[PDB]
Amino acid sequence: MNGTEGPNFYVPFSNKTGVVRSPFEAPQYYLAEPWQFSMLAAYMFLLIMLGFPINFLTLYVTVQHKKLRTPLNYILLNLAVADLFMVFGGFTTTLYTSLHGYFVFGPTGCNLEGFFATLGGEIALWSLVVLAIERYVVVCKPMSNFRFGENHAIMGVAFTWVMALACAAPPLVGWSRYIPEGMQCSCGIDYYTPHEETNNESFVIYMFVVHFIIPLIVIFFCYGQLVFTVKEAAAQQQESATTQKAEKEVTRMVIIMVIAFLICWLPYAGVAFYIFTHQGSDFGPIFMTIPAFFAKTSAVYNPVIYIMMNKQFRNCMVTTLCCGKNPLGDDEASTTVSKTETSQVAPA
Ligand SMILES: *[C@@H]1O[C@H](CO)[C@@H](O[C@@H]2O[C@H](CO)[C@@H](O[C@H]3O[C@H](CO)[C@@H](O)[C@H](O)[C@@H]3O)[C@H](O)[C@H]2NC(C)=O)[C@H](O)[C@H]1NC(C)=O
Ligand SMILES: *[C@@H]1O[C@H](CO)[C@@H](O[C@@H]2O[C@H](CO)[C@@H](O)[C@H](O)[C@H]2NC(C)=O)[C@H](O)[C@H]1NC(C)=O
Ligand SMILES: *C/C=C(C)/C=C\C=C(C)\C=C\C1=C(C)CCCC1(C)C
Ligand SMILES: CCCCCCCS[C@@H]1O[C@H](CO)[C@@H](O)[C@H](O)[C@H]1O
Ligand SMILES: *C(=O)CCCCCCCCCCCCCCC
Ligand SMILES: *C(=O)CCCCCCCCCCCCCCC
Ligand SMILES: [Hg+2]
Ligand SMILES: [Hg+2]
Ligand SMILES: [Hg+2]
Ligand SMILES: [Zn+2]
Ligand SMILES: [Zn+2]
Ligand SMILES: [Zn+2]
Ligand SMILES: [Zn+2]
């Protein structure tokens, strides 16, 4: 056999030399050099050091500035929360696991590791479909007098958690399951064994269709809409109104956010589909370690894109960080927001 299937795992390594050992019971240094696990460990460490501050700061700024209440300000607050669950929820176990070369906490640690990374990536995916819509509704504007209230935003946000849970929670209760991958320091869905006892093959198709192919289609199609309408070609103050102008900006970002997602998840999803379609073949531990661990940057790139592509949020952050105010920068030239400063309501 090309690998070592276990009742709970599947090491992508032969046991012809009987050197293979349950990744819930002993180090896996026979799969790779010990320094490489240190790499994973060092890496998970730096990611937690970046992901915590960046996501918490994002979260703190959004709340403190009483005017940051657009559908986008919501979706990104949602993402910051989901990213903090990633950091504390599973990254703590993946660093702990990398440090020992195996899942000392056994399947429980594997479930934390798998669930939160899944929950996180899937909340991002669904939050992108919501943006695609909102994006659409504003650009190609379907109604002749409609506007997303905060309620809607909270709707979309609530929706992303139902959809993400629909995919991440099943494996914790008998449908498919989380199992260690690559150097066995991370945990994902089961694409390795057909384990009928927990109905793995069906869940995998359920996830690639309901939680992937489909949301992608929506998002892409929706784009093919904001193709003839709002385009990447973004000019200066007023595009037909400085209003319309700054509309082109949010869309440019929602589009970058999509590219960042694919870069981050296509390789993983790709290796994952392969394995599913080539169960038992001869792949090694590094095969999935690389995209699996690279995809964990998904807990941080969202806020970066946001702060770099949103003059208003960046300013509210500089305003916040600069303890007092003095949003130096160039401000937003347009609206601003905060708590006691110029968070002065100014609609109509
Ligand atoms: C790869 O081949 C190895 C040799 O066949 C095999 O080693 C076997 O590992 C088990 C661990 O479950 C040992 O069983 C021990 O189980 C408990 C320990 O808590 C006790 O009842 C005894 O101490 C018992 O020995 C086997 O002794 C051991 N057999 C050997 C070394 O020949 C690996 O498990 C195989 N890799 C896999 C499939 O994970
Ligand atoms: C172990 O892995 C090897 C290589 O991945 C598998 O060999 C392949 O077998 C398929 C048919 O199942 C052929 O289409 C390929 O051409 C084979 N490639 C090679 C390298 O010979 C092998 O099947 C696997 N063994 C199992 C079933 O555990
Ligand atoms: C490091 C831990 C990881 C990557 C744990 C598991 C992640 C998954 C099972 C992710 C699945 C998918 C996502 C988030 C994005 C769309 C494609 C997908 C279904 C492969
Ligand atoms: C960017 C998406 C990545 C898509 C995943 C490609 C899986 S490709 C697969 O990898 C194996 C490694 O053990 C090779 O042995 C095999 O020849 C190759 O076809
Ligand atoms: C105004 O004073 C100019 C901006 C300078 C602020 C320096 C930015 C340092 C970033 C550290 C913030 C970490 C957030 C805390 C998370 C717990
Ligand atoms: C509120 O306005 C304070 C700004 C918050 C960012 C923290 C800035 C730190 C100040 C610079 C410290 C220099 C480093 C010296 C190390 C010995
Ligand atoms: Hg769109
Ligand atoms: Hg990424
Ligand atoms: Hg602001
Ligand atoms: Zn079983
Ligand atoms: Zn989902
Ligand atoms: Zn199969
Ligand atoms: Zn500026």
Side-chain angles (χ1 to χ4, degrees):
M1 300 301 285
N2 291 303
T4 301
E5 175 185 40
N8 218 187
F9 57 89
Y10 183 81
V11 186
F13 197 83
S14 192
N15 198 45
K16 181 191 179 171
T17 68
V19 71
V20 175
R21 302 232 48 201
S22 177
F24 290 125
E25 278 155 32
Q28 308 290 306
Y29 301 138
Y30 61 77
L31 292 182
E33 314 306 286
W35 67 266
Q36 302 180 292
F37 283 81
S38 299
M39 281 277 87
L40 299 178
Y43 172 71
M44 288 320 307
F45 171 85
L46 298 178
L47 263 192
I48 292 174
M49 181 157 286
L50 266 170
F52 169 44
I54 289 166
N55 278 295
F56 180 74
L57 209 213
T58 292
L59 161 64
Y60 190 108
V61 167
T62 307
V63 169
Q64 161 175 285
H65 293 245
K66 275 55 196 181
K67 313 299 299 310
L68 295 167
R69 302 291 178 275
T70 64
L72 177 68
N73 292 313
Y74 276 81
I75 281 314
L76 265 104
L77 176 50
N78 174 48
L79 269 7
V81 179
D83 293 348
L84 281 163
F85 273 122
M86 298 188 78
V87 180
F88 294 115
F91 286 17
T92 45
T93 287
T94 155
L95 167 58
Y96 188 77
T97 294
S98 289
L99 281 171
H100 297 293
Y102 81 102
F103 276 102
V104 324
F105 300 130
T108 306
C110 180
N111 288 305
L112 293 172
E113 220 301 310
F115 178 72
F116 283 117
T118 300
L119 225 205
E122 274 302 319
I123 280 171
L125 172 61
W126 287 112
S127 283
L128 282 177
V129 181
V130 181
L131 274 33
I133 300 319
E134 191 264 41
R135 194 76 317 242
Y136 181 76
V137 171
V138 301
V139 167
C140 297
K141 201 165 189 175
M143 281 58 255
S144 296
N145 56 301
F146 179 73
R147 183 194 70 184
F148 289 107
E150 272 159 43
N151 46 314
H152 307 165
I154 307 175
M155 294 307 89
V157 165
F159 160 72
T160 63
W161 282 86
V162 179
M163 299 312 293
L165 266 299
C167 178
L172 303 171
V173 301
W175 196 20
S176 173
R177 58 180 177 180
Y178 288 109
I179 198 174
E181 312 180 75
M183 277 167 252
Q184 311 289 290
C185 288
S186 65
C187 271
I189 296 304
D190 203 335
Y191 331 105
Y192 306 82
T193 71
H195 200 227
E196 295 172 37
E197 190 194 319
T198 207
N199 299 85
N200 287 4
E201 304 257 324
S202 50
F203 181 90
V204 171
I205 294 160
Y206 150 73
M207 174 189 76
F208 273 115
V209 181
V210 171
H211 307 289
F212 183 51
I213 295 176
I214 283 184
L216 266 321
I217 297 161
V218 166
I219 295 178
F220 278 117
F221 177 69
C222 171
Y223 170 69
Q225 305 312 272
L226 281 58
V227 68
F228 184 58
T229 318
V230 78
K231 298 185 302 72
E232 312 177 305
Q236 44 214 299
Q237 322 77 205
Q238 173 203 303
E239 201 86 307
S240 278
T242 289
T243 284
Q244 179 280 61
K245 161 70 277 79
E247 204 37 278
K248 203 144 303 181
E249 175 195 36
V250 168
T251 314
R252 228 315 212 210
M253 170 170 112
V254 169
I255 299 175
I256 287 294
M257 281 180 79
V258 176
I259 294 306
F261 183 90
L262 302 155
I263 292 181
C264 205
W265 294 99
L266 258 12
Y268 175 68
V271 173
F273 188 71
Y274 178 87
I275 290 158
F276 181 65
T277 59
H278 293 67
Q279 318 175 92
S281 53
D282 195 10
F283 42 84
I286 312 299
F287 188 39
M288 179 56 110
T289 297
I290 312 291
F293 272 70
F294 165 62
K296 300 177 166 353
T297 51
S298 66
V300 306
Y301 77 75
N302 279 121
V304 182
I305 298 182
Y306 184 41
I307 305 165
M308 310 316 305
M309 298 188 81
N310 213 262
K311 209 99 169 61
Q312 176 180 61
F313 185 75
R314 184 165 66 239
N315 263 282
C316 274
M317 180 195 77
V318 177
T319 281
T320 301
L321 281 178
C322 307
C323 299
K325 187 206 172 194
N326 176 46
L328 294 318
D330 294 10
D331 245 292
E332 211 283 73
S334 297
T335 52
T336 24
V337 37
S338 321
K339 200 192 61 187
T340 179
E341 71 146 306
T342 193
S343 216
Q344 48 206 75
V345 183

mmCIF file of all heavy atoms in Angstrom, residues 7 177 195 197, ligand 10:
data_model
loop_
_atom_site.group_PDB
_atom_site.id
_atom_site.type_symbol
_atom_site.label_atom_id
_atom_site.label_comp_id
_atom_site.label_asym_id
_atom_site.label_seq_id
_atom_site.Cartn_x
_atom_site.Cartn_y
_atom_site.Cartn_z
ATOM 1 N N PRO A 7 -7.350 3.789 11.670
ATOM 2 C CA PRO A 7 -8.810 3.855 11.851
ATOM 3 C C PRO A 7 -9.289 5.285 12.001
ATOM 4 O O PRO A 7 -10.477 5.604 11.868
ATOM 5 C CB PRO A 7 -9.023 3.043 13.128
ATOM 6 C CG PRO A 7 -7.715 3.265 13.891
ATOM 7 C CD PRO A 7 -6.665 3.191 12.831
ATOM 8 N N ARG A 177 -15.153 13.627 8.363
ATOM 9 C CA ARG A 177 -14.435 13.820 9.625
ATOM 10 C C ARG A 177 -13.153 14.577 9.355
ATOM 11 O O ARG A 177 -12.755 14.680 8.196
ATOM 12 C CB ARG A 177 -14.098 12.461 10.261
ATOM 13 C CG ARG A 177 -13.252 11.575 9.356
ATOM 14 C CD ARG A 177 -12.911 10.223 9.958
ATOM 15 N NE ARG A 177 -12.156 9.414 8.999
ATOM 16 C CZ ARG A 177 -11.708 8.176 9.221
ATOM 17 N NH1 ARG A 177 -11.935 7.570 10.387
ATOM 18 N NH2 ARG A 177 -11.022 7.536 8.272
ATOM 19 N N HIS A 195 -14.089 5.581 4.006
ATOM 20 C CA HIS A 195 -14.739 5.381 5.334
ATOM 21 C C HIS A 195 -16.264 5.546 5.260
ATOM 22 O O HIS A 195 -16.795 6.615 5.609
ATOM 23 C CB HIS A 195 -14.160 6.363 6.390
ATOM 24 C CG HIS A 195 -14.386 5.958 7.826
ATOM 25 N ND1 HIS A 195 -14.853 6.837 8.783
ATOM 26 C CD2 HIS A 195 -14.124 4.803 8.484
ATOM 27 C CE1 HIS A 195 -14.866 6.243 9.964
ATOM 28 N NE2 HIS A 195 -14.427 5.008 9.810
ATOM 29 N N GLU A 197 -18.488 4.222 7.109
ATOM 30 C CA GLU A 197 -18.996 4.348 8.486
ATOM 31 C C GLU A 197 -19.377 5.781 8.853
ATOM 32 O O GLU A 197 -20.219 5.991 9.704
ATOM 33 C CB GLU A 197 -17.917 3.841 9.454
ATOM 34 C CG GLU A 197 -18.341 3.674 10.915
ATOM 35 C CD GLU A 197 -17.132 3.502 11.873
ATOM 36 O OE1 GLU A 197 -16.155 2.784 11.521
ATOM 37 O OE2 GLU A 197 -17.164 4.085 12.987
HETATM 38 ZN ZN ZN B 10 -13.892 3.604 11.419
#
